[PDB]
Design a protein around this ligand. Structure first.
Ligand SMILES: CN(C)C(=O)N1CCNCC1
Ligand SMILES: CN(C)C(=O)N1CCNCC1
Lengths: 39, 156
C-alpha cells in the first residue's frame, strides 16, 4: 500500500541555487503519455 | 489524516524497505501527482484513505479527494523554481529559466534539471508561490541530459 508523508511548504525562496539551461526542442506526445524527440 | 497544504513524498512498502516512488502537492483538500507515480491506486495518509477522483494517462496526471485545483501557468518569460523532493533528502528549491517543448498542438515550458526517478511529481513554482506544473514527464536529449515538461492540468 502506498502512503504520503509531508515534506515541506510550497514557497518561492530568495537566493535559491540557480542552475539548468533552457533548450528549445521539437517533441511528440504519444497516446501512452511518453514524450519523444522529433528531428 | 494529513490534509495540510504543501509538498508530500509518495512512499511504498512493496519493494525493499520503504521506497519513495514519487512526490505530490496537497492544495484545497486535493492531492495532485503524476499518473506514473501511483498508477491510479489509492493512497494512505496516516489512518486516512485518499481515493483517486480524476486521472489521464496521456497528460500523466491524477488527483485524489476532488478535482484538479492547480491552474497557474508559466508566463513564458520568467525564471521558476523546481521544489525538488529527492528520495531520502530534504526539500530543496532550484531556480531555473525554462526551455520549450514545441509540439504539433502547441508549446509547453520545460525544465532541464536531473533528479532520481522518485522525484517525479515535485512542483514547479512562479514568483508568487503558485504551482505552475509538476516535474517528471519528459525526454533525454543528445548529450544524455534529461529535460522534463512543466506538466499542468485544467481546473474546471
Ligand atoms: C544537479 N542538477 C540539477 C543536475 O543534474 N543538473 C545540472 C545542471 N542542469 C542540468 C542537470
Ligand atoms: C522521470 N525521471 C525524473 C527519471 O526517470 N529520471 C531522469 C533521468 N535520470 C534518471 C531519473
Amino acid at each position: 500500500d502506498m502512503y504520503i508523508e509531508r515534506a515541506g511548504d510550497i514557497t518561492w525562496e530568495k537566493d535559491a541555487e540557480v542552475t539548468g539551461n533552457s533548450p528549445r526542442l521539437d517533441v511528440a506526445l504519444d497516446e501512452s503519455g511518453d514524450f519523444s524527440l522529433v528531428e | 489524516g494529513e490534509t495540510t497544504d504543501g509538498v508530500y513524498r509518495v512512499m511504498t512498502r512493496r519493494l525493499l524497505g520503504s521506497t519513495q516512488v514519487g512526490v505530490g502537492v496537497m492544495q484545497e483538500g486535493v492531492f495532485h501527482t503524476m499518473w506514473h507515480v501511483t498508477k491510479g491506486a489509492a493512497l494512505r495518509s496516516g489512518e486516512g484513505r485518499l481515493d483517486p477522483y480524476w486521472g489521464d494517462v496521456k497528460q500523466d496526471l491524477v488527483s485524489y479527494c476532488g478535482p484538479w485545483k492547480l491552474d497557474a501557468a508559466w508566463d513564458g518569460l520568467s525564471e521558476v523554481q523546481l521544489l525538488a523532493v529527492p528520495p531520502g533528502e530534504r526539500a530543496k528549491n532550484i531556480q531555473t529559466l525554462p526551455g520549450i517543448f514545441k509540439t504539433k498542438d502547441g508549446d509547453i515550458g520545460a525544465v532541464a534539471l536531473d533528479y532520481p526517478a522518485g522525484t517525479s511529481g515535485s512542483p514547479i513554482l512562479d514568483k508568487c508561490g503558485r504551482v505552475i506544473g509538476l516535474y517528471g514527464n519528459g525526454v533525454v536529449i543528445k548529450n544524455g541530459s534529461y529535460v522534463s515538461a512543466i506538466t499542468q492540468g485544467k481546473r474546471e
